[PDB]
């Protein structure tokens, strides 16, 4: 009798849809939870490697400044040594008629 | 000689490259993840719809059959009433 068989067919499809929809749902929750853990792990590694780079950038900044001062000090030392050398040469040349 | 600018410069370059390569690879992974999850979501959306349409098909058939059974009960109850009435007249 078709009332009975249609009732059975309906129940069987409802059970399939309901079991399916629970799987889609549990699958989405598991995926979200896995992405969350992985994104948190990444943010820890990001924060740490930025700190390490930022410390080396500070040192590099200090060193670029030191090098610039060294060039400045050397230039002035060279200027003063060159003018003394020149004066001695001018005195010698003059002293040789 | 221990901590020159050249050494620091190389160290900062090396660190920047590792950080950028990491951020890139992980960016690709996030995009691939979203692409796959979008694809699955659209696939299930379709399978869902066709399962729902199948169910609704039989639900409508079942609905008609419940209606037809209710009709049959009504007709049978009426026929039984009329037959018992005629019969009753012969029972005296």
Numbering used by the authors:
A (entry chain A): 23 to 119
B (entry chain B): 21 to 112
Show me the paper's own sentences about this structure.
N6-methyladenosine (m6A) is the most abundant and prevalent internal modification in mRNA. In mammals, m6A exerts pivotal roles in posttranscriptional regulation and its dysregulation is implicated in various diseases including cancer. m6A is installed by a multicomponent methyltransferase complex (MTC, also known as the m6A writer complex). The mammalian MTC is composed of the core m6A methyltransferase METTL3–METTL14 complex (MTC core) and several regulatory proteins including WTAP, the adaptor responsible for METTL3–METTL14 localization and proper substrate recruitment, and VIRMA (KIAA1429), the specificity mediator that mediates preferential m6A modification at the 3′ untranslated regions (UTRs). WTAP and VIRMA are important subunits of the m6A writer complex.
Two molecules of WTAP (with the assigned density of residues 150–241, WTAP150–241) formed a symmetric parallel α-helical coiled-coil homodimer through hydrophobic interactions between two identical surface patches. The structure of the asymmetric WTAP171–237 dimer in the quaternary complex is similar to the crystal structure of the symmetric WTAP150–241 dimer with a root-mean-square deviation (RMSD) of 4.2 Å over 134 Cα atoms. However, compared to the WTAPs alone, VIRMA-bound WTAPs bent around the observed N-termini (around WTAPA residue 188 and WTAPB residue 185) and displayed a more compact and dense conformation with distinct intramolecular interactions.
